[PDB]
Design a protein around this ligand. Structure first.
Ligand SMILES: [Cl-]
Ligand SMILES: [Cl-]
Ligand SMILES: [Cl-]
Ligand SMILES: [Cl-]
Ligand SMILES: [Cl-]
Ligand SMILES: [Cl-]
Length: 209
């Protein structure tokens, strides 16, 4: 069975300290239920706010699906992610919700679809959306430090990863055992990276190398 303790020993490696991450030291509680609806920025068109439904829960994260699209692009968000908001947030602030990329109907049908989707829906309560944790003051990451990162091919999982390079505020995240596949750059304040042990702390899905 994979254990970070044995893994770090075996690989002669060391974890990125917890202060490197925009993650609370005490993970946020998850009071969402499956079927709750909320507002979320479309992961494939992040300028747009759409309706999302909670279709699964794993630890501190929600498995979300944009209403009106298929099941092939589900995305995962922390319960303290700023990229989700309560229903009503957009319109309260003078905005308009937008259809999801891959909306199965035509554009002209979106307003009808939004109305009928929300009528009789369980809205996630405003109170269960957690404020984001504070950002680190700067990029504490160092090349070679180990961490956990959302599995970019299947975000259901979180994977052991290593810092490949640091450039200013950016880090190159590399997935252990993947031989360079799905290497990607993110800013040090990314919500998709976590200190070692965050999966076991929160009850999430850690995929061994
Ligand atoms: Cl922090
Ligand atoms: Cl609000
Ligand atoms: Cl209508
Ligand atoms: Cl629905
Ligand atoms: Cl009714
Ligand atoms: Cl630099």
């Amino acid at each position: 069975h994979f254990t970070w303790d044995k893994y770090l020993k075996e690989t002669c490696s060391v974890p990125a300290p917890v202060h490197c991450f925009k993650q609370s030291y005490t993970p946020p509680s998850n009071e969402f239920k499956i079927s709750m609806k909320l507002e979320a920025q479309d992961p494939r068109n992040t300028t747009s706010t759409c309706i999302a439904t909670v279709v699964g829960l794993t630890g501190a994260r929600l498995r979300l699906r944009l209403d009106g699209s298929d099941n092939k692009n589900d995305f995962w968000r922390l319960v303290d992610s700023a990229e989700i908001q309560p229903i009503g947030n957009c319109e309260k602030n003078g905005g308009m919700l937008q259809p999801p990329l891959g909306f199965r109907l035509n554009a002209s049908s979106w307003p009808m679809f939004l109305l009928k989707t929300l009528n009789g829906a369980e809205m996630a309560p405003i109170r269960i959306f957690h404020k984001e944790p504070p950002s680190p003051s700067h990029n504490f990451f160092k090349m070679g430090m180990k961490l956990e990162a959302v599995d970019r091919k299947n975000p259901h999982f979180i994977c052991p990863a290593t810092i490949g390079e640091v450039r200013g505020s950016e880090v190159l995240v590399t997935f252990d055992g993947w031989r360079g596949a799905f290497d990607y750059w993110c800013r040090f304040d990314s919500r998709d990276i976590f200190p070692v042990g965050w999966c076991s702390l929160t009850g999430d899905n850690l995929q061994p190398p």
